[PDB]
What does this fold into?
Amino acid sequence: AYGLGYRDWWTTYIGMSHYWKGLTAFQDKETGELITEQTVLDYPILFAGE
Amino acid sequence: GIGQIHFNVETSRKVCLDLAKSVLRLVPVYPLVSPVKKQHDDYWFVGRLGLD
It folds into this structure.
């Protein structure tokens, strides 16, 4: 933009879509409960010996 | 050469059954619990801004 000769002023319209923070979650239909975190359920068992 | 020092396959299966029965005896019920307790149809995918 400087190379082509535009000088001395700039006005930018910040977008609607990107400038904010946000979250995503599951909302249960029966009750307004929000689930935002995840977990791994697993049951390792160690076999050691001869 | 050396002989009769390791189990057969069938005895290995029997010992594994015994171990499974013992471990079940210690822990009769499934301990772990999951935050998501319903099928995918029940939940509603929504997006929010930052909490509060």
